[PDB]
Enzyme design. Structure first.
Site, PDB file in Angstrom:
ATOM      1  N   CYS A  36      47.213  27.355  13.628  1.00 23.06           N
ATOM      2  CA  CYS A  36      45.984  27.883  12.958  1.00 23.06           C
ATOM      3  C   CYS A  36      44.759  26.999  13.748  1.00 23.06           C
ATOM      4  CB  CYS A  36      45.594  27.893  11.449  1.00 23.06           C
ATOM      5  SG  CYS A  36      46.093  26.614  10.589  1.00 23.06           S
ATOM      6  N   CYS A  39      42.350  24.229  12.441  1.00 20.16           N
ATOM      7  CA  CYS A  39      43.216  23.468  11.805  1.00 20.16           C
ATOM      8  C   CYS A  39      43.351  22.140  12.473  1.00 20.16           C
ATOM      9  CB  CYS A  39      44.597  24.042  11.248  1.00 20.16           C
ATOM     10  SG  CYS A  39      44.607  25.493  10.086  1.00 20.16           S
TER      11      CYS A  39
END
Length: 112
Positions: A36, A39
């Site tokens: 992600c 992230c």
């Protein structure tokens, strides 16, 4: 016991939870993942707070990519998902990057 490290196992989460001496302090877990994108930036951002709030506050950077079980059990969805298991129980939560709110919660729960 500020275990301000990154981890990818339930066993190590448990270990840290214990040696952390959670009794009276914020277990700030960042349930984040590899894939992600953002992230990967949010982690080192939170690492700053981790460095700062050492000793007392436990900054568990949990790799959801690995510890899927604990993540879903805890109720992680929109990673990164930050939870504050202060003392030893989910006292507060914060989803998404939400840096300012994250900072505010860390401060709030740390100064208590």
């Amino acid at each position: 016991g500020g275990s301000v490290i990154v981890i990818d196992s339930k066993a190590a989460w448990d270990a840290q939870l214990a040696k952390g001496k959670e009794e009276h302090k914020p277990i700030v877990v960042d349930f984040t993942a590899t894939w992600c994108g953002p992230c990967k930036m949010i982690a080192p951002l939170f690492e700053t707070l981790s460095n700062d709030y050492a000793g007392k506050v436990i900054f568990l950077k949990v790799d959801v990519d690995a510890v899927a079980a604990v993540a879903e059990a805890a109720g992680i969805t929109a990673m990164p998902t930050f939870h504050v298991y202060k003392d030893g129980v989910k006292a507060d939560d914060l989803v998404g990057a939400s840096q300012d709110k994250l900072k505010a919660l860390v401060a709030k729960h740390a100064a208590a």
